[PDB]
Structure 1
Amino acid sequence: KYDVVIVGSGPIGCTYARELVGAGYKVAMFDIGEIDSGLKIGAHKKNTVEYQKNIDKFVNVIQGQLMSVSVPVNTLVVDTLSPTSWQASTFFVRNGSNPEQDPLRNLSGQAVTRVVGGMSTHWTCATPRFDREQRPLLVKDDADADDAEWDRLYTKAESYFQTGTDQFKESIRHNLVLNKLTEEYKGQRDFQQIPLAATRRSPTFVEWSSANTVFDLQNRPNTDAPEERFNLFPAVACERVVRNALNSEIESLHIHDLISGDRFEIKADVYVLTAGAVHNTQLLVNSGFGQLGRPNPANPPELLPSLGSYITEQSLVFCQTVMSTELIDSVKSDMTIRGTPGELTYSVTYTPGASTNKHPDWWNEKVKNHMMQHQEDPLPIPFEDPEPQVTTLFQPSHPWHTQIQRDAFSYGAVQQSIDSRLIVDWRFFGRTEPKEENKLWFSDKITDAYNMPQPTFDFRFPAGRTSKEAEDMMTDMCVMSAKIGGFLPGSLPQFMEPGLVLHLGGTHRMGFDEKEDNCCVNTDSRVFGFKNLFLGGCGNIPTAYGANPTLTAMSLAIKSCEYIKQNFTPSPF
């Protein structure tokens, strides 16, 4: 028996923990995954000295914890086997494939992470706000009040995440990219640093935020928090919330301890589901919400008919560029350079403070030093330069989010021929209209690795605006990136596999009225009809959005916590 039980220890579960543990509730938190991030429970895995000295290795860590949601049956022909090798006569269901999955109506890139801290153990930490055009309403029929509510929530969310916009201000490459782009757009698009949940500790080390930043996940009471009560239970699969007959209250949570194998039930006053966009839906359908099985337009679910419909996932386009001669030369534009590198007469000098200098003395010092101390190196960019972190945020005229960076990347053998300082990643993210026909449903026959109903997507990018914009977005990235340099072979402009982006929303969406807004939760994130069940995460987001959604999810979760605080009393200590 607890006051509040939270399912999932991602950053959204940790938001509930942070708020409700702090308010004096007796909180339990369950995660199907385990503690595997260091002694700072749920912390960012890229926060080791060794990763930040070998950053491209971190892509392997990400890949290592993204388990595909729905893999269709493979029908590739291998006919170069030896005649003595066994072979089936059909492409039968194998290797964990989902036989319900139509391969042409999938989000093949969709994956989930089951570790304490969830995906915040490996995420990129971009935390932009949504402008009005992307953001759900919290107040109807008063845009000023709606804006005020959002500003207060986002401000608190940025606090929890430790979001900043200045941590890369001394990167030459950041500047080189940003300063060029902003000159070329006539004042009509603004470029800034990507808002990042991160705190720089030194010129070569950044403490990336995670779930741990939000709530440290240590059991309470403890010496630092003698009057707070929190337990975390890893390796516990949460299987079912038990509805009363009237569908007005949750009465218990069924759990399966993965280590001992025993199954228990846990009683709480308040149940919060923060298991991710896919797994919140799955846990609800396994508890009798919506329906199991292929959905039928004839026979709609009587409980939460909108659950698992109107799903949205963003279109994502990607390339890399190799920095232009014009930009590399500009790095050293203030220098007088005489002689040949490595010879007795070679020198690189600038005049401090000169008004005709393009760059401040701090830049020129770094470049001159690099050029004189490494005469074997033909580039003016210092070696430990921080990576670019550049965006122009979504606007009506360019309704896509943008990120221009140099993230961990496993370069092929030939790409590795190009100096990393020259390389810039482009990721542009489109918004997807919610459509009732776009669904996440669950098999009534087939189960996943945890014996839970197997997730199946029925998804296509909507015709109309969504598809028109996606292609206009690809074009925008081709045009914009050309200002910085040409494409890197092997990383040419491309659409990524649907749902590789992992910004799925709308699976259990928010609105004012269940029927009118075709939704599942209200603006307190409370499940319609239920006094004591709340959902948190990107699945609540009901709108077409391009920007990264976690900050917005967190903001909604703070609002939900406020409701819980106003309506449920902590048990006495």
Structure 2
Amino acid sequence: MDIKYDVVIVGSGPIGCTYARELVGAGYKVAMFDIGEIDSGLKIGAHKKNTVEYQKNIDKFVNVIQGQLMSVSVPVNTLVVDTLSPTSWQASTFFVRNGSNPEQDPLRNLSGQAVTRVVGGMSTHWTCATPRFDREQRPLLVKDDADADDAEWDRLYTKAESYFQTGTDQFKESIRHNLVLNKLTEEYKGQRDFQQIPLAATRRSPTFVEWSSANTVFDLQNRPNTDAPEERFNLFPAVACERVVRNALNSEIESLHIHDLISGDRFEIKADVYVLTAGAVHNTQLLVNSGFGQLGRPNPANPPELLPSLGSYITEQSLVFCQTVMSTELIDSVKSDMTIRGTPGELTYSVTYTPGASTNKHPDWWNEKVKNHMMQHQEDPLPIPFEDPEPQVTTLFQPSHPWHTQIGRDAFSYGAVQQSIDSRLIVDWRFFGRTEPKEENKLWFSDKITDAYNMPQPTFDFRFPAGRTSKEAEDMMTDMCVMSAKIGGFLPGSLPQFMEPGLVLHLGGTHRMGFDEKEDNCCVNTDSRVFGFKNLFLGGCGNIPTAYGANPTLTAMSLAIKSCEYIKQNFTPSPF
């Protein structure tokens, strides 16, 4: 560890790693700290689902996700257990037990909000959906010139898609995927468009997908190394970053205070440029612990000195979910080109098709797969091959359906998984609503209660806004009911439901971006620079100030790319 770096980055998730990729590349001496540790294999920060075993047993990956989602704010428990033996120690009150947060109102929480403290952050477990936001969901980067604003986003999103290796055809050879995609296209003919979910991923074989992550963005190897002999990067895991130190002018940061969790020692680190990419919750925590915003229960009669919008106007998306069981009509359609003779299991049994026959509804590749499955597995009643990949279908957010959608089979299941119904028949439906930013919706940090790392405890004060947010959320549920019915009935045990607030993990607006601090109620400018500070930058979904329904990470990355332009234009790298 050195005394002094060109740039310090707090957090190694995909947004931290965007900053590293750009600045390490531009020749800066970069240090990156993460509170968590390297635990993804030799590719540091990579996706945990890229093992041969998890892709052979994908039903088990939910357990990996759950084991690194640590709840943000758990209210005091008030469950009555009155069947204890008379000899057991028995409470007289519902006292603060088991790391609960006595500041949290259980009725105004994001109970499902959680954090991930491992090298690579949440990108070690995430779904890898990376849609662009349309104009309606997206903050302006150019005022008063929509075509110019559009052009800038397209520039930035194109770059972000390259860093993540976003593509839209990795699932093109899936029967199930096409079955669903085509049915929906036909049912909403001239009303809505369907396509593959954009996915940050590269297919390696018919049965293996290399899912992208922070590692994809930047490999997180210390530099210089053989492949990059003139670059300078050090990653320091198991270091908790606690505070940035302001100068008396509140014009520059002077150091970053850190706690090395292995030695227990506290240090400070000096850099020219400080970048906080700790996540939408923990960026705000670090800032509040550093004298930005307001510590403690909000007090409008004691106005904060700096960044008064910090922690306000938070947004989190409503999420509705169900699964279905593929319709008999759809299943029979898979095999509509086959001529069947005889009885399965017999020597005379024959399933045939003509390779090119004008009247065939499907391509030869599809009919070959179906013929082979049906002849090679004559005990199986379905025409879908066993290793057929899952659908990955969306209709992206539009004014007439202002929600994002993901239709297929997400690793992050929400109940004990079904064994009874054939997995090939199951399709999941997730619809994601946009949430109006409102000043009164807050993330704040206790002045008394502390978390597991001895930092001010996070507390939510959130309700979905009345008005459009709520009307849309319920129209969105109805829409999922209506659309999912075109494919099959609900799966018992996965009936349509709203998910626990914040389970979705699309929290935004905790350190939001705008043109003007006062008029736009914001914390950072369109270069992601904290107002008034020369050398402090925030990265992440906390920057997003709008009501959005699509998954935010690609948007956050695009903003970090633009931030790094500013840094490269305004700070000189030290000599090597």
TM tier relative to shorter chain: over 0.9
CA distance in 2, matches of 1:100, 1:337: 67
Instruction: Tell me how far apart the structure 2 counterparts of residues 166 and 244 of structure 1 sit (CA, whole Å).
Output: 51
Match of 1:343 in 2: 346
Matches within 5 A, 1:4-15: 4-15=7-18
Contact 1:57–1:410 at 8 Å: present in 2 too? no
2:81, 2:359 → 1: CA distance? 66
Deviation, structure 1 residue 212? 0.3
Native 8 Å contact 1:110 1:498 kept in 2: yes
8 Å contact from structure 1 (residues 338, 347) kept in 2 = yes
Any conservation in 1 of the 2:127–2:411 contact (CA below 8 Å)? Answer: no
Deviations, residues 498-526 of structure 1 (Å, cap 9, x unaligned): 00000000000000000000000000000
Stretch deviating more after TM superposition (24-33 or 403-412): 403-412
Contact 1:327–1:484 (Cα < 8 Å) also in 2: yes
Deviations 1:27-52 (A, max 9, x none): 00000000000010000000000000
Within 1, Cα distance between the matches of 2:341 and 2:407? 34
The one-character-per-residue Cα deviations of 1:401-431 (angstroms, maximum 9, x if unpaired) are 0000112255867831000000000000000
8 Å Cα contact 2:76-2:101 kept in structure 1: yes
Task: Please tell me whether the aligned partners of residues 196 and 393 of structure 2 are also in contact (alpha carbons under 8 angstroms).
Answer: yes
From the superposition, tell whether residues 413 and 239 of structure 1 become closer, same or farther in structure 2 (CA, over 3 Å).
closer
The 1:520–1:570 alpha-carbon spacing in structure 2 relative to 1, beyond 3 Å, is: same
Residues 169-205 of structure 1: CA deviation (Å, up to 9, x unaligned): 0000000000000100122100000000000000000
Write the distance in 2 (CA, Å) between the matches of 1:22 and 1:220.
11
The 1:168/1:442 distance shift into structure 2, 3 A limit, reads same
Q: Is the 8 A contact 1:415 1:489 kept in 2?
A: no
Provide the rounded CA distance (Å) in 1 between the counterparts of 2:303 and 2:428. 45
TM-score (ref. length: structure 1)? 0.99
Distance 1:189 1:299 in 2: 50
- Relative to structure 1, the CA distance from residue 414 to residue 504 in structure 2 (aligned partners, 3 Å threshold; closer, same or farther) is closer
Aligned residue for 1:295? 298
CA distance in 2, matches of 1:300, 1:14: 35
Distance 1:501 1:389, change over 3 A: same
Greater Cα offset, 471-480 or 401-410: 401-410
Whether the 8 Å CA contact 1:415–1:488 is kept in 2: the answer is no
Moved more, 346-355 or 423-432: 346-355
Question: Does the CA contact (< 8 Å) of 2:404 and 2:433 recur in 1?
Answer: yes
Answering whether residue 313 of structure 2 is matched by residue 310 of structure 1, we say yes
Does structure 2 retain, via aligned residues, the 8 Å contact 1:9–1:30?
Answer: yes
Question: Do the aligned partners of residues 487 and 224 (structure 1) sit closer, same or farther apart at CA in structure 2, a change above 3 Å counting?
Answer: same
1:32-88 residue CA offsets vs partner (Å, 9 max, x unmatched): 000000010000000000000000100000000000000000001000111111111
User: What secondary structure is seen at the aligned counterpart in 1 of 2:273?
Assistant: strand
**CA 1:413–1:210 in 2, change beyond 3 Å: closer, same or farther?**
closer
With structure 2 as the length reference, what TM-score do the two structures score? 0.99
Give the Cα–Cα distance (whole angstroms) in 2 for the partners of residues 291 and 3 of structure 1.
30
Partner Cα distance (2:457, 2:529) in 1: 25
Moved more, 115-124 or 294-303: 294-303
SS at match of 2:419: helix
The runs of 4+ residues in structure 1 deviating greater than 4 Å are 409-414
Per-residue deviation, 1:346: 1.8
Cα distance in 2 for partners of 1:97, 1:465 equals 33
Q: Distance in 2 between matches of 1:155 and 1:417?
A: 43
TM-fit CA distance, 1:302 = 1.9
Contact 2:450 2:456 in 1 (8 A): yes
Partner-residue secondary structure (3-state), 2:475: helix
Flag structure 2 segments of 5+ consecutive residues without an equivalent.
Answer: none
Q: Deviations over 1:117-176 (max 9, x none)?
A: 000000000000000000000010101110010000000000000000000000000000
Shift of 1:338: 1.9
Distance 2:22 2:168 in 1: 25
Alignment equivalent of 1:268, drawn from 264, 267, 271: 271
Task: Output the CA distance in 1 between the equivalents of 2:415 and 2:218.
Answer: 38
**Residues 337 and 348 of structure 1 are in contact (CA less than 8 Å); yes or no, is this contact kept in structure 2?**
yes
Cα distance in 1, alignment partners of residues 198 and 420 from structure 2: 31
Change (3 A) 1:142 1:36: same
Q: What's 1:434 paired with?
A: 437
Alignment deviations for residues 269-298 of structure 1 (CA, whole Å, 9 cap, x no partner)? 000000000000000000000111100122
Q: Is this contact kept in 1: 2:124–2:213, CA < 8 A?
A: yes
Mapped pair 1:555 → 2:566:
no
How many residues align structurally?
A: 573
SS of 1:416 mapped into structure 2: coil
Q: CA RMSD in A?
A: 0.9
What is the distance in 1 between the residues matched to 2:8 and 2:347? 72
Contact 1:3–1:25 (Cα < 8 Å) also in 2: yes
- Counterpart CA distance in 1 for 2:414 and 2:47 is 23
* Cα distance in 1, alignment partners of residues 226 and 418 from structure 2: 52
SS at match of 1:328: helix
Check 1:414–1:161 CA distance in 2 against 1; reply closer, same or farther (3 A cut): closer
1:475 corresponding residue in structure 2: 478
Report the Cα distance in structure 2 between the residues aligned to 1:380 and 1:78, rounded to whole angstroms.
51
Q: Could you tell me how far apart the structure 2 residues matched to 1:298 and 1:387 are?
A: 54
- Equivalent residue, structure 2, for 1:352: 355
After superposition, the Cα gap between the structure-2 partners of 1:207 and 1:7, relative to the gap in structure 1 and judged at 3 Å, is: same
Q: 2:224 touches 2:230 (CA, 8 Å); kept in 1?
A: yes
Contact 2:65–2:412 under 8 Å retained in 1: no
Q: Decide whether the 8 Å contact of 2:45 with 2:219 is kept in 1.
A: yes
Shift of 1:380: 0.1
**Which secondary structure state, in structure 1, belongs to the residue aligned with residue 303 of structure 2?**
coil
User: 1:35 & 1:411 partners in 2: Cα distance?
Assistant: 27
Aligned CA distance change for structure 1 residues 169 and 308 (closer, same or farther; 3 Å): same
User: Any idea what SS the aligned residue of 1:486 has?
Assistant: strand
Look up the SS of the partner of 2:108 in the other structure.
coil
What secondary structure, in the 3-state scheme, does the structure 2 residue paired with 1:52 have?
helix
| Alpha-carbon distance, 1:300 to partner | 2.1
Tell me how far apart the structure 2 counterparts of residues 80 and 340 of structure 1 sit (CA, whole Å): 59
Equivalent in 170, 181, 195 of residue 192 of structure 1: 195
Secondary structure in structure 1 of the residue aligned to 2:281: helix
Distance 1:67 1:422 in 2: 32
Q: Distance in 2 between matches of 1:396 and 1:304?
A: 33
Give yes or no for contact 1:536–1:553 (8 Å, CA) kept in 2: yes
1:3 Cα deviation from its structure 2 partner: 0.4
The 1:412–1:238 alpha-carbon spacing in structure 2 relative to 1, beyond 3 Å, is closer
Cα separation, 2, equivalents of 1:329 and 1:398? 30
Pick the aligned partner of 1:67 from 59, 67, 70: 70
| Structure 1: gaps of 5 or more residues | none
Once the two structures are superposed, residues 319-360 of structure 1 have per-residue CA deviations (whole angstroms, 9 ceiling, x without a partner) of 000000000000000011122211232211111111111001
What is the CA-CA distance between 1:530 and the residue it aligns to?
Answer: 0.3
1:94 is aligned to 97
Tell whether the 8 Å contact from 2:434 to 2:547 is kept in structure 1 after alignment. yes
